[PDB]
């Protein structure tokens, strides 16, 4: 399955500067664009080679979209502070995420367009792409305004049409890397804690996409409550890393097995110390 996803963050900064607006866009786990209103002369900027060779009309139009959105979010931050009767002294955050998911058959599975204020759900476009869910009384004001303005029809046209068209264009132009799977490189390390126990750590390195499952078993039984799992983390080169650890009694290492599932593996892997 493939997705195109946009992430907007708007932050008010009383006393320090004008509000910040930063946008990033992704296809699957690969970023392709950034816009930051704090930059010297803010423009849409490429982050993937398969958007670097778009022409000037493409980049000029994306830049103008972002400039419009930054102004809209400056107004939105002021509107929300009024809705909630918040002090002008505080810094607040408005986030928006939207995009389109294609299912494994290549057809549109889901469009979404949702907002959070100060880290809490505010309003979201429902899966029918026609109605809204408001999280609180302030967001019901926005819901009435957007129902009156027929906002959902505009968003639906993007999410079902324009969004999918962009995603398909990028999947073709960036095919060499977006359609790739990089299997995890796997190994186990061993770390004595004391004379009586040691941690076994199972590693997955250099994989793409980021989705992965790492599990420890002991005589074929999952060690769910005993396993420490770090968050999947970017290597910095477009690939990802993860590890899973268990603390085992000294001399019982051979009862433990690590199990790795990933899109780039034909069969799940089994590792032993």
């Amino acid at each position: 399955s493939h997705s195109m996803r946009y992430f907007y963050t708007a932050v008010s900064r009383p006393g320090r500067g004008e509000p910040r607006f930063i946008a990033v866009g992704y296809v699957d786990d690969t970023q392709f664009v950034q816009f930051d209103s704090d930059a010297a002369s803010p423009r849409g900027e490429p982050r993937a080679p398969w958007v670097e060779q778009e022409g000037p009309e493409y980049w000029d139009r994306e830049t103008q979209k972002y400039k419009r959105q930054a102004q809209t979010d400056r107004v939105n931050l002021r509107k929300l502070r009024g809705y909630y009767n918040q002090s002008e002294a505080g810094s607040h955050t408005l986030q928006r995420m939207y995009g389109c998911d294609l299912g494994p058959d290549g057809r549109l599975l889901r469009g979404y367009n949702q907002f959070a204020y100060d880290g809490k759900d505010y309003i979201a476009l429902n899966e029918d792409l026609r109605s809204w869910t408001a999280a609180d009384k302030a967001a019901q004001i926005t819901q009435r305004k957007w129902e009156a303005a027929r906002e959902a029809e505009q968003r639906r046209a993007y999410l079902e049409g324009t969004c999918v068209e962009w995603l398909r264009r990028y999947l073709e132009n960036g095919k060499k890397t977006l359609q790739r799977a990089e299997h995890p490189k796997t190994h186990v390390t061993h770390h004595p804690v004391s004379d009586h126990e040691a941690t076994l750590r199972c590693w997955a390195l250099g994989f793409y996409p980021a989705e992965i499952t790492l599990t420890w078993q002991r005589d074929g039984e999952d060690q769910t409550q005993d396993t420490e799992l770090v968050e999947t983390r970017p290597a910095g080169d477009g690939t990802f890393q993860k590890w899973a650890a268990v603390v085992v009694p000294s001399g019982e290492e051979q009862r433990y097995t690590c199990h790795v599932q990933h899109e780039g593996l034909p069969e799940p892997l089994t590792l032993r110390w």
Binding site: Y58, E62, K145, T162, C163
Partner: peptide, 10 residues
């Protein structure tokens, strides 16, 4: 490409 038509004002 970003969602640019209209103005999504809260």
């Amino acid at each position: 490409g970003a969602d640019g038509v209209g103005k999504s004002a809260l």
